[PDB]
Amino acid sequence: IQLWQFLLELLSDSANASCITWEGTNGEFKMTDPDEVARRWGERKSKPNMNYDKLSRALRYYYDKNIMTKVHGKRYAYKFDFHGIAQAL
Amino acid sequence: PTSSRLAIQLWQFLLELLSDSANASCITWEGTNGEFKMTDPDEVARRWGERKSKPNMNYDKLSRALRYYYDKNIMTKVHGKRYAYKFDFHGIAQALQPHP
DNA sequence: GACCGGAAGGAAGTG
DNA sequence: CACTTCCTTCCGGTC
């Protein structure tokens, strides 16, 4: 698996709710527990040595590669970008 | 701290410092709890700068690092006491010997 | 001004 | 490459 897919995969499970959620309707999501999620991006990826600090650094390589964007000024909230997302898929 | 790399991270560096009383003037232990105090934060910061060849380094910045260690359970703030922090060896353990 | 933790991104390391 | 690692840098907020 690769990170952008993993997150979608989790979002899909919107029986989760508490730990992650769609904000807007144009690809906008917000971990309402970036800890809970950072664990899961490790449990699955094989790394309990993994945290929000490392998690978000990779979503920043997702900026240059146009795979994802940051929602300017709402906390833990990010924008999915279909442009680069498909170009990988 | 010798175990650290016999066979460079700030927390190793702090241990490196805290292992030699000659450094007492800028940092020292407070108990056998793992608590330590920066007697001279600026002089510590300076020395972390010198090491990473980053000459603009300071306590503002260094302490942001230390703050990221809270999440990795590699240390904690001594609440109230100034420039005072506490190693926790449980997090160092998971760093040297990841046990899933 | 200490202490906090978001948010950015360099830069060498990993599989 | 696809992050991972560990910061360094800047920051507004709260005490």
Indicate the burial class of B74 (C-beta count within 10 angstroms; 0-12, 13-18, 19 or more): buried
Whether residue B36 contacts residue B58, with contact meaning beta carbons closer than 8 Å, is answered with no
Name the DSSP class of B2. -
Experimental method: X-ray
Neighbouring CB atoms inside 10 A of B84's CB total: 14
Q: How many residues does chain B have?
A: 100
Q: Which residues on A lie below 8 Å from B68 (Cβ)?
A: 53
Tell me the two tokens of residue B30: 């407070």
CATH number at residue A7: 1.10.10.10
Q: How would you write chain A as a 3-class SS string?
A: CCHHHHHHHHHHCCCCCCCCCECCCCCEEECCCHHHHHHHHHHCCCCCCCCHHHHHHHHHHHHHCCCEEECCCCCCEEEECHHHHHHHC
Please tell me the distance from the alpha carbon of residue A8 to that of residue A47, in angstroms, as a whole number: 20
Please tell me the distance from the alpha carbon of residue B87 to that of residue B32, in angstroms, as a whole number: 11
Please tell me the distance from the alpha carbon of residue A68 to that of residue A3, in angstroms, as a whole number: 11
CB B48 within 7 Å, strand D: yes
Number of folded domains that form chain B:
1
Concatenating the DSSP letter of every residue in B12-65 gives HHHHHHHT-GGGTTT-EE-SSSSEEE-SSHHHHHHHHHHHTT-TT--HHHHHHH
Please tell me the distance from the alpha carbon of residue B56 to that of residue B48, in angstroms, as a whole number: 10
Whether the CB of A56 is below 8 Å from some CB of chain B: the reply is no
Resolution in A: 2.6
For residue B79, give Cα distances in angstroms to B16, B82, B83, B92.
Answer: 24, 8, 10, 21
- Contacting residues for A2 by C-beta, under 8 A, at least 6 apart: A88
**Cβ-nearest to B71 among A46, A48, A52:** A52
Q: Which of B13, B51, B48, B14 is nearest to B34 (CA)?
A: B14
Question: Whole-number Å distance, CA B10 to C1' D7?
Answer: 9
Quote the domain boundaries for residue B65. Answer: 3-96
Please tell me the distance from the alpha carbon of residue A7 to that of residue A34, in angstroms, as a whole number: 12
CB B72 within 7 Å, strand C: no
CA atoms within 13 A on the CB side of A66: 6
